[PDB]
Every structure is written in structure tokens, then in C-alpha cells.
Design a binder for this molecule. Structure first.
Ligand SMILES: O=C(O)[C@H]1O[C@@H](O[C@H]2[C@H](O)[C@H](O)[C@H](O[C@H]3[C@H](O)[C@H](O)[C@H](O[C@H]4[C@H](O)[C@H](O)[C@H](O[C@H]5[C@H](O)[C@H](O)[C@H](O[C@H]6[C@H](O)[C@H](O)[C@H](O)O[C@@H]6C(=O)O)O[C@@H]5C(=O)O)O[C@@H]4C(=O)O)O[C@@H]3C(=O)O)O[C@@H]2C(=O)O)[C@@H](O)[C@@H](O)[C@@H]1O
Length: 227
């Protein structure tokens, strides 16, 4: 009884350039399935026209994964001269109790390392400063270094918020509601990797493994701009 995101033309292009992974890294719906009206409790269109992702369980996900229209997986040079841009209008509801962090957008390499995660966190402590109920950028310091550089981007609001990730040469920038919140962070540690975008709900370290993480996107796209 769920309405498909594909019924809104604002999502046709990104769905054509995506596959849906749920509840783990297995594909449940390819582009052609998504465009044919794929809909489920973990992926549906709300009555006010948000694409809503919902999932429970530790490290479980409902997430779109960037694809080419050819059906090739996206695998662009992480540090190449072509700009890669992901834009989304995201409403982050107040999360259920037991939900501690939800990744909503990613730049991921083609193996096992996330270049960037944008995530809601109940709390984070950075260089001695604790922030609560914020949106966070996490950039991994390298494939062989589990540590990351963390940057608070925004105080959590339920209001629809514009996020832009711009990746070009060895630099990554994030804008939030038109304001640069991460200005040309270095990602040269991913020279020689290939990369793709992800977007949705990716549930990190819940304290209640049955609670549902939930994330709503009013717009979503990922594009290239050739230099
Ligand atoms: O700063 C502090 O406060 C403390 O930080 C601590 O370290 C942190 C660290 O800073 C950072 O926060 C880190 O975050 C974790 C994160 O919680 C989460 O676990 C994340 O998960 C990753 C995985 O590591 C893995 O990369 C996985 O890869 C996926 C892909 O996403 C993709 O789905 C892929 O699909 C392909 C498969 O081939 C499929 O079969 C399919 O068919 O094809 C696809 C395809 O390519 O299309 O499959 C991959 C898979 O294997 O599942 O993706 C997730 C992800 O999506 O991001 O990992 C990060 C991380 O950076 O490791 O957590 C640390 C921590 O908690 O310890 C400490 O440093 C502390 O001292 C600080 O104080």
C-alpha cells in the first residue's frame, strides 16, 4: 500500500542513476525496478512528496548507490579533474529512542572505505568540545588509518535543509543551506581510488537494535561537470 518515489518526476533522473541497497550491501532494487514503481516500508513516497528511507538494526541501511545510466556502477576518479556534485534537500526527523547516529550522504570508495559520511549524531566530542544533536562530516584519514577528521556542519533541525557535496581535484567541500561548512578539505589520501555517492539512511551503532532510523529527502541528484 506504499506509493513509489518513481511517481514523482523530480526523482526519475537519480533513480535512473541508482540502485537501492537494503538492509545490507545487497541490491534489492536496480534502476529499472526503481523506475517501475518499487516501494516498500523501507523506501516510499510520503503524502507530502518526500522520498523516505527507514531501517532498523546495527549497521543496516536503506540507501541509494550511485550508478551510471549504462548500468555500470559509478566509479569516478576520487581526486580527478572532473567535478562530482551531490545535492539533496533532507528533512531529518527527531530520531526514535535508541538511534544514536544515521548516515544520510556518503562519498565511498570502490572497496571498503567511506571517504565522507554526513551523519546525524546524538553526541560527538571533537578536540575536547562536545556537541549534541548535530549534523557531522566525517572524512577518513586514509584506507589504512581507521581514524577520521570530524567537523560539525549544522545544529539538527527538522526543517528541510539543502546539502551540497562538491568533489574536484583532491578537494571536497560541503555547503549547508548555501553556506560553506567544510571548505576544500583534502582527500588526496584517496589518490588512485575510485568513488561514488550514496544517500539514504545508514544506521550506525544504535543502542536499541529494533528502533527505526528514518530520513526524508525532498530532492536528490548527483551529476558531473566536465572541466
Ligand atoms: O572521532 C571519534 O569520536 C572517535 O572515532 C573512532 O573511529 C571511528 C571513525 O572516526 C569513524 O566514525 C568510523 O565510522 C564507521 C561507520 O560507523 C560505519 O561503520 C562505516 O561502515 C562502512 C564500512 O566500513 C564499509 O566500508 C561498507 O562498505 C560497503 C559499501 O558502502 C557498499 O555498500 C559496498 O557495496 C558493494 C558490494 O560489493 C555489494 O556486494 C554490492 O553488490 O556491490 C556494492 C557496490 O559497490 O555497489 O559494500 C561494502 C560492504 O562491505 O558492506 O560501507 C559502510 C559505509 O556505508 O560507510 O565505516 C566507518 C569507518 O570509517 O570505518 O567508526 C570508527 C569507530 O567507531 O571506531 C575512534 O577513532 C575514536 O578513537 C574516536 O574518538
Amino acid at each position: 500500500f506504499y506509493t513509489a518515489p518513481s511517481t514523482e518526476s523530480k526523482f526519475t533522473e537519480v533513480l535512473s542513476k541508482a540502485k537501492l541497497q537494503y538492509p545490507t550491501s545487497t541490491t534489492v532494487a536496480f534502476a529499472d525496478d526503481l523506475l517501475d514503481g518499487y516501494a516498500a516500508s523501507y523506501f516510499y513516497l510520503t503524502s507530502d512528496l518526500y522520498m523516505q528511507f527507514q531501517v532498523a538494526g546495527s549497521s543496516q541501511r536503506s540507501e541509494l548507490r550511485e550508478m551510471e545510466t549504462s548500468g555500470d556502477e559509478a566509479a569516478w576518479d576520487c581526486t580527478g579533474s572532473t567535478a562530482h556534485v551531490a545535492s539533496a534537500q533532507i528533512a531529518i526527523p527527531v530520531q526514535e529512542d535508541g538511534i544514536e547516529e544515521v548516515t544520510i550522504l556518503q562519498v565511498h570508495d570502490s572497496d571498503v572505505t567511506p571517504v565522507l559520511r554526513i551523519s546525524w549524531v546524538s553526541s560527538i566530542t571533537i578536540d575536547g568540545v562536545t556537541s549534541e544533536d548535530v549534523v557531522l562530516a566525517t572524512i577518513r584519514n586514509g584506507i589504512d588509518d581507521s581514524t577520521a577528521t570530524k567537523t560539525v556542519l549544522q545544529a539538527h533541525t527538522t526543517s528541510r535543509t539543502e546539502f551540497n557535496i562538491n568533489v574536484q581535484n583532491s578537494k571536497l567541500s560541503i555547503t549547508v543551506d548555501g553556506t560553506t561548512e567544510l571548505d576544500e578539505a583534502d582527500i588526496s589520501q584517496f589518490d588512485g581510488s575510485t568513488c561514488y555517492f550514496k544517500a539514504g539512511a545508514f544506521n550506525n551503532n544504535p543502542t536499541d537494535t529494533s528502533a527505526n532510523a528514518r530520513i526524508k529527502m525532498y530532492e536528490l541528484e548527483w551529476v558531473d561537470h566536465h572541466h
